[PDB]
């Protein structure tokens, strides 16, 4: 056998192919296929140490803390650029993106089971050690160019900033320090251990990450290819990347390798990312003029002399009048809305 | 309105048999008019650049 059975009115993929397909014109629910995948930021010391990072210190203080960039991954950022619906719309329904399936992955290892090449003899007639430690594979997605928090310790540091560390240095900048707000808008600087969610702010970013600490802590993996992640939630949604420009957000840390010195230097590794996009319509939510103070005013000049603005006021009087009502017979009365309501005080 | 000419008449070519060049003015008379048009366009746009 073989058959004319009845196969599948499966979907309608249109093209495929990257960045092309962008350009595209209008059909619905539109939804889509990212292949991507981001480098890693390692401080990377090189063209070796190109996705690993320089190594590391030992017993220290504080005090004795200088970094300085090599050994230091900071978060990997992007703006995808995105389509933009809106280009001609003028409909009174709007659409934006909504934010559909991720099926990511850290990719590509598989060099890296060499116990071998400087993977520091662990002894006996077996090999090295390669690399491994603690690693955090972590990613957060956001649809905003995010809301960071940084987090430090050792504010007695002397910190760089290429690598954008959180400012501030206060006791309580090591604890939560309320300050080190930040926010990431930035790729590499965010120094990873730096640098935490402001995750109140943190709504329209989705991330999952395991911070992986220990010791060399195994990694176990999974090679599935055929399941995704949903980024819907009880809305149905995951960052919005109402940015039709993305906000892309990364550490992967796959922990150290170790050289023959134990040159421990974290290794980090790219993670490629699957998602799916779908065409979500809202309301207006905001309203004109809102909007149309800027124009107008903008394509414009300023206009302030003797002072008036604000409270700096050669202004007088703000009240209400109004209506034309019989006669109560306190008219002088100071005349006032509560706010709901009318409130009416004195001294008289 | 965008205005581009081009033009060679030559380079003067001197008493000497030397060369250096030479040019001219462009002359226009433009009869134009008005077309209506749609916009297909809008705030949508504005308002997401706004955002941007």
């Given at each position: 056998?073989?058959?004319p059975k009845?196969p599948?009115?499966?979907?309608?993929?249109?093209?495929?192919?990257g960045?092309?397909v962008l350009?595209?014109?209008?059909?619905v629910?539109?939804?889509?296929?990212?292949?991507?995948?981001l480098?890693?930021?390692?401080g990377?010391?090189?063209?070796?140490?190109?996705?690993?990072?320089?190594?590391?210190?030992?017993?220290?203080?504080?005090?004795?803390?200088?970094?300085?960039?090599?050994?230091?991954?900071?978060?990997?950022?992007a703006?995808?650029?995105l389509?933009?619906?809106?280009?001609?719309?003028?409909?009174?329904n709007?659409?934006?993106?909504?934010?559909?399936?991720?099926?990511t992955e850290?990719?590509?290892?598989?060099?890296?089971?060499?116990?071998?090449?400087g993977?520091?003899?662990?002894?006996?007639?077996?090999?090295?050690?390669?690399?491994?430690?603690?690693?955090?594979?972590?990613?957060?997605?956001?649809?905003?160019?995010?809301?960071?928090?940084?987090?430090?310790?050792?504010?007695?540091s002397?910190?760089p900033?290429?690598?954008i560390?959180?400012?501030?240095?206060?006791?309580?900048?090591?604890?939560?320090?309320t300050d080190?707000?930040?926010?990431?808008?930035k790729?590499n600087?965010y120094?990873?251990?730096?640098?935490?969610?402001?995750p109140s702010?943190?709504?329209?970013?989705?991330?999952?990450?395991?911070?992986t600490?220990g010791?060399?802590?195994?990694?176990?993996?999974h090679?599935?290819?055929?399941?995704?992640?949903?980024?819907?939630?009880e809305?149905?949604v995951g960052p919005?990347?109402?940015?039709?420009?993305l906000?892309?957000?990364?550490?992967?840390?796959c922990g150290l390798?170790?050289?023959?010195?134990?040159?421990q230097?974290?290794?980090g590794?790219?993670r490629?990312?699957?998602?799916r996009?779908?065409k979500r319509?809202?309301?207006?939510?905001?309203?004109?003029?809102?909007?149309?103070?800027?124009?107008?005013?903008?394509?414009?000049?300023?206009?302030?002399?003797?002072?008036?603005?604000?409270?700096?006021?050669q202004?007088?009087?703000?009240?209400v009048?109004?209506?034309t009502?019989?006669?109560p017979?306190?008219?002088?009365?100071?005349r006032?809305?509560?706010?709901?309501?009318?409130?009416?005080?004195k001294m008289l």
């Amino acid at each position: 056998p073989k058959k004319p059975k009845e196969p599948v009115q499966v979907p309608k993929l249109l093209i495929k192919g990257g960045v092309e397909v962008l350009e595209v014109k209008t059909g619905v629910d539109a939804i889509t296929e990212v292949e991507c995948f981001l480098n890693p930021e390692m401080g990377d010391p090189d063209e070796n140490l190109r996705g690993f990072s320089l190594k590391l210190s030992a017993e220290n203080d504080f005090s004795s803390d200088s970094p300085e960039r090599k050994m230091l991954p900071c978060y990997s950022t992007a703006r995808i650029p995105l389509p933009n619906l809106n280009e001609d719309l003028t409909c009174g329904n709007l659409l934006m993106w909504e934010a559909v399936t991720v099926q990511t992955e850290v990719i590509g290892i598989t060099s890296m089971l060499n116990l071998h090449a400087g993977s520091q003899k662990v002894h006996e007639h077996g090999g090295g050690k390669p690399i491994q430690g603690s690693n955090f594979h972590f990613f957060a997605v956001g649809g905003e160019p995010l809301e960071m928090q940084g987090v430090l310790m050792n504010y007695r540091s002397k910190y760089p900033d290429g690598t954008i560390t959180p400012k501030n240095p206060t006791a309580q900048s090591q604890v939560m320090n309320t300050d080190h707000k930040a926010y990431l808008d930035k790729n590499n600087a965010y120094p990873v251990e730096c640098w935490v969610p402001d995750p109140s702010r943190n709504e329209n970013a989705r991330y999952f990450g395991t911070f992986t600490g220990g010791e060399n802590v195994p990694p176990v993996l999974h090679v599935t290819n055929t399941a995704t992640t949903v980024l819907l939630d009880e809305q149905g949604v995951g960052p919005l990347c109402k940015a039709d420009s993305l906000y892309v957000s990364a550490a992967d840390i796959c922990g150290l390798f170790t050289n023959s010195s134990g040159t421990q230097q974290w290794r980090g590794l790219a993670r490629y990312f699957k998602i799916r996009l779908r065409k979500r319509s809202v309301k207006n939510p905001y309203p004109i003029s809102f909007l149309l103070s800027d124009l107008i005013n903008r394509r414009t000049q300023r206009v302030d002399g003797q002072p008036m603005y604000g409270m700096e006021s050669q202004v007088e009087e703000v009240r209400v009048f109004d209506g034309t009502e019989r006669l109560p017979g306190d008219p002088d009365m100071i005349r006032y809305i509560d706010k709901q309501g009318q409130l009416q005080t004195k001294m008289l």
